[model samples]
Target: SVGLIWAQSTSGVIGRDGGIPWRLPEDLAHFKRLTMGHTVVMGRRTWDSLPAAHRPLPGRRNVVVTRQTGLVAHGAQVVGSLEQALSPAEPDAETWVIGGAQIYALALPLANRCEVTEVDVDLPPEDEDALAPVLDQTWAGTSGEWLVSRSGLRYRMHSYRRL
Candidate 1:
């Protein structure tokens, strides 16, 4: 089944000017633990956002969805559509839809589970340029909230299953 993974701030911000606005290393580590060894499907922008040192995220299958023909994502399988990206994932393996906003919106309906990291800070109210898909419209609601960090930067992980 298709799964989704992402972290968002309290203001629903998922990205700011094409990059993540936060610096919570624990959240990144949490992301790594959940997605490693899975098939990760992502938008081109998400693929581009990866640091050069971490492109293709080690130990996982990377699939990039893009309309740009001949786009070369080193170590990643580039596809023009979401279906193409997900088609190669093994049936029993979890196929993760990792994202930028557009990809998450498209993948939500097809997702069976969502692993979200809720950071305690909110982006400025005026920064509406990039935001995550509204959770209430996607999954029923979050359950199993686990505190991930509790220092200056607080966050939690909430796993949700679609109804």
Candidate 2:
């Protein structure tokens, strides 16, 4: 199975103060295009952040990761761990790991491909308090390829194959 990770960040900052402080329409559009019809694995907090219209990202299967069993959403399934949520999928299928901070941290290391939207806008160092820790140089060790969209938003989309 290929683990596809998606994130939106500005100036290397994912969140500021308390939540995502910047908005990039381009990044959101790109993310939607890529994640449609896929299975998204998100942390409990991430699932709570969705707007009513965007609740389930429409066509995709939603798998929320939480330690608590029996957590239920109107259109989602709750799984206790990544292995539980992902084990049943076919190897060729793509899975998206969406996040708050902790979930992303847990998933990034195990992810095969990272679909990231790198923003050029930076945040004040002091205001950058909410985002997940930056992906260190260690992430470069994973094989990735970049694709640039017409909006000029370049996304580094990676497809990782388990060896």
Candidate 3:
């Protein structure tokens, strides 16, 4: 099954003065709890954004999407596209699409579970460029058994049965 996890700011902000602009310990903790044993794919920027201690994102197979030349990392696989990165996974394996804006956009169409962190916060007028694309409006939310969130940030974990 393909799983998508989207972590973005509501104010159309992707980054703060320098980093992500929100505080949701519940979000990351929730993510780690559910996805620890899956294969996590992310774009180069997202992979690099991880703190050194968190770089390989423990307990998950790390596949980073990139077109950069001569890249290498221990316990991490780097590829040039989402297709190439995902093609080799075992069939029926739970795969998670982590991000960077372009990566999320590319994976949205293919992911079955969209785990989005919808921050109900605001963005600075001049910082609008940092936002990730809104969830594709057509991807309907799952029925009672599949979508949820438990905090004030107003995020919902939406799981859709792939069509």
Candidate 4:
């Protein structure tokens, strides 16, 4: 049950220095709907960017994979690698890698399914925009109808599976 999920700008900017350039409350709600009751795995950076309220995302087993030695993520079980995080034989562990570029790249190779929510914004290229992983030829995706968020930004979801 390997899954990769992200909300990125149409130009591929996942985040601009620990924050998204645009706000989409609907996308946030959508993410909560998709990830609830599933195991969420994220990078240290992504975990840090999260609001203080969602440190250990409620209703999900939070796993933080980091190389930082002896690190402890309060409510999350800090691990070394994605493989190590997925190694445990837990009952009903539907693992989802939801994170910064680093963790996203690491899981893309093995993640069987991907959920991408594309925001209609072209981020200015000043510094690198912490981009998300590219969907290669081995994967195929189907996009849903575009809808406008409360913030007046359009976004659409795309579900991709390895072919």
Candidate 5:
């Protein structure tokens, strides 16, 4: 099944300046725990945001979808479209669509499950922390809240299943 993993603020912000706005180590660990050993699909920008040392994210297959041709993503597979990225991960292994907003929007429909970390904070639009685009009505909650409290910030994790 196609799955998505992301964290957003109470105001629905997911990133700033092409990277995460907050520094929550616990949440980072949470992300690693779920995505480890699985295939992760992301946009070219998302791949760029990753630290050079962590590019291709150890232990997982990294697939990057981008419009640019002849660009190499050193340790990751680069594809022109989302279909080509998802195709190789299908039928057996678990796959995740890890993001930047545009990639999330494109892959959300194909996702059977989404893991969301709802952070409790309000951020202004100018902060450059990007927000996710609209999600369709078919995405419904499928799990109870899982609280994650750290460094004076509290967030909740929830699972949504597509209808």
Candidate 6:
């Protein structure tokens, strides 16, 4: 099943311009824990934002969706659309829709659940141009204990099931 995954600021901002505004080293490992052995679907820009060493995001199958047909993304599969990206996964696959804002919006409605990391910092709303898709009233969530990152930033994990 497809699940949405992201780390959002206290104000619901997922990104600043094309990237995330804050750093959480712990979030990286947490993301790995949730997605290892599964697939990660992302818009081309999200793939581009990845650092060289982490490109294709290590062990996961990276599916990059782009309108630029025939373009090859090293270490990742290129697909023309999100629908095509999700269709070919194995039925039991825990495919995660990793984002670039627009991709998250597109997948939110169809995704069965969400893995959210709620950051404690509240950023400037004006610069926080990319916001997470609203969870609204259709979902039920359980939040885990609030914890601190090595850098002393606070965060918590949440699992939301779309009902």
Candidate with maximal lDDT: 6
Mind giving the per-residue lDDT tens digits that candidate 4 earns over 37-78?
Answer: 988999999889888899889999899989997997898988
Candidate lDDT scores, in order, read 0.82, 0.65, 0.71, 0.88, 0.83, 0.89
Question: Clashing residue pairs in candidate 2, if any?
Answer: none
TM-score of predicted model 3? 0.79
List ranges where model 5 is wrong by over 4 Å: 89-92, 142-148
Residues 23-86, candidate 6, lDDT per residue (tens digit)?
9988988899999888999999899889789897988888999999989899999999999988
Q: What is the C-alpha RMSD of each candidate to the true structure, in Å?
A: 2.1, 4.1, 3.6, 1.2, 2.0, 1.5
lDDT of 1 at 61: 88
How badly does each model clash, as a count of residue pairs?
0, 0, 1, 0, 3, 0
On lDDT, who's better, 2 or 3?
A: 3
lDDT of 5: 0.83
lDDT by residue (1-163, candidate 3, tens digit) is: 7778766655556654435777767668877986898888988877877878888999888999888857987779888889987796454378888776778778878776676665556766363354565655666666223323454565544454444
Two-way lDDT contest, 3 vs 4, winner: 4
Q: For model 5, how does the per-residue alpha-carbon lDDT over 72-124 read when each residue is reduced to its tens digit?
A: 88889889999888888444378999998888988887788898887876776
Stronger candidate by lDDT (1 vs 3): 1
Ranking by lDDT: 6, 4, 5, 1, 3, 2
Q: Which consecutive 10 residues in model 3 have the weakest lDDT in total?
A: 143-152
Residue 47 in model 3: shift from native, Å? 1.0
Using TM-score as the yardstick, the better of models 4 and 5 is: 4
Q: Stretches of candidate 2 above 4 Å error?
A: 8-11, 16-19, 89-92, 125-128, 136-138, 141-163
How much lDDT does candidate 6 score?
A: 0.89
Model 3, residue 81: distance off in Å is 1.2
